[PDB]
């Protein structure tokens, strides 16, 4: 039960990354390709707890 | 894999699996290592599907 919002880049290598990303350090956010052309295993389910 | 990141900056490092940093936490037994040379304009279509 801990929401975490952060736009900072996460380093995944020996080099320290501050504003450069793409090869060794990645951006921690990926989007959904929510299209109606899929079947059932990729549709957006509106989940409330 | 700590001696892997000292062979010049890369061009594409997108992956469809586990992280390179967590490779040390899981112990393996069989990995394929094959290499070739293609023109730099033809790297983009090396992708699953």
């Amino acid at each position: 039960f801990e929401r975490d919002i952060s736009t900072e880049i996460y380093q995944a290598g020996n080099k320290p990354c501050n504003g450069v990303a793409g090869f060794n350090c990645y951006f921690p956010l990926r989007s959904y390709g929510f299209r109606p052309t899929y079947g059932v295993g990729h549709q957006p389910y509106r989940v409330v707890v | 894999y700590s001696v892997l990141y000292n062979f010049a900056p890369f061009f594409a490092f997108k992956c469809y699996g586990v992280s390179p940093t967590k490779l040390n936490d899981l112990c393996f037994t069989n990995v394929y290592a094959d290499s070739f040379v293609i023109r730099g304009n033809e790297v983009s279509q090396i992708a699953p599907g």
Partner: antibody, heavy 126, light 109 residues
Framework: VQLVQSGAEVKKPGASVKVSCKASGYIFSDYNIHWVRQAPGQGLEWMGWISPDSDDTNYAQSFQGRVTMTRDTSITTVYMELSSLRSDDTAVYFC????????????????????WGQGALVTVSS | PVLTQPPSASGPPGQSVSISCSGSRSNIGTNFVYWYQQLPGAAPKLLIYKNDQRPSGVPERFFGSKSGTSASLAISGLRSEDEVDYYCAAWDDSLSGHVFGAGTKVTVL
């Protein structure tokens, strides 16, 4: 799809000018629009984005109070107006549609202007 | 803010000439870079999306990439369609909106 839009002509400064964008072919409920301007012999500049299915809106950090927006979903159009026009605003205006859908601030990264609307040069003189 | 590009760059046909596009910490490097070309007296169109790929109808002739806080584009063959200008585009957080380049002109020799 085709993105015909109606331009304007030479006009007195400080008046109100109406420019409209028409959407055809594709369904006009799922794609954002973006507004850009191009001065002659100059790089492009960004205005903001407006959702078609909502009153969603957002503007740039320099052009805030001189711009409003109007939607006509029944006519399947969007309406764009300029108030307090300047001398160095004689720029061609593009009704740019971006692929996908974004309303959040952090959503704008994956957005490229898939298609553009042909523009007409709007001028201001007396 | 704006992105610094050379106003012009030219090369003879049959070989490859490149265009540079510098960027700051927030302008590029933490984000994705897109490129647009425009025919003179016409509407601009997409050239490279998602920093590597091209849309349908754009051939394999076009290529562009970035390494650090700057991006580069490569063309090969200047016959009838590469005399147009090119633009470098990205997204940042200081202006909270799309920031575009100045403009690059490519001719033939």
């Amino acid at each position: 799809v085709q993105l015909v839009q109606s331009g304007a002509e030479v006009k007195k400064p400080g008046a109100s000018v109406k420019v409209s964008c028409k959407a055809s072919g594709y369904i006009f409920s799922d794609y954002n629009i973006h507004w850009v301007r191009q001065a002659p012999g100059q790089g492009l500049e960004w205005m903001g984005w407006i959702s078609p299915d909502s009153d969603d809106t957002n503007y740039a950090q320099s052009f805030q109070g001189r711009v409003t927006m109007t939607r006509d979903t029944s006519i399947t159009t969007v309406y764009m107006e300029l108030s307090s026009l300047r001398s160095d605003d004689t720029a061609v205006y593009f009704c740019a549609r971006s692929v996908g859908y974004c309303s959040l601030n952090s959503c704008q990264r994956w957005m490229w202007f898939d298609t553009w609307g042909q523009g007409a040069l709007v001028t201001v003189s007396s | 803010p704006v992105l610094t590009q050379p106003p012009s760059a030219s090369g003879p046909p049959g070989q490859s000439v490149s265009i540079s596009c510098s960027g700051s910490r927030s302008n590029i490097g933490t984000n994705f870079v897109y490129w647009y070309q425009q025919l003179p007296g016409a509407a601009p169109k997409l050239l490279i999306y998602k920093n590597d790929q091209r849309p349908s109808g754009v051939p394999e002739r076009f290529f562009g990439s970035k390494s650090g806080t700057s991006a580069s584009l490569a063309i090969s063959g200047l016959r009838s369609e590469d005399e147009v200008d090119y633009y470098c585009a990205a997204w940042d957080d200081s202006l909270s909106g799309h920031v575009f380049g100045a403009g690059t002109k490519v001719t033939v020799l």
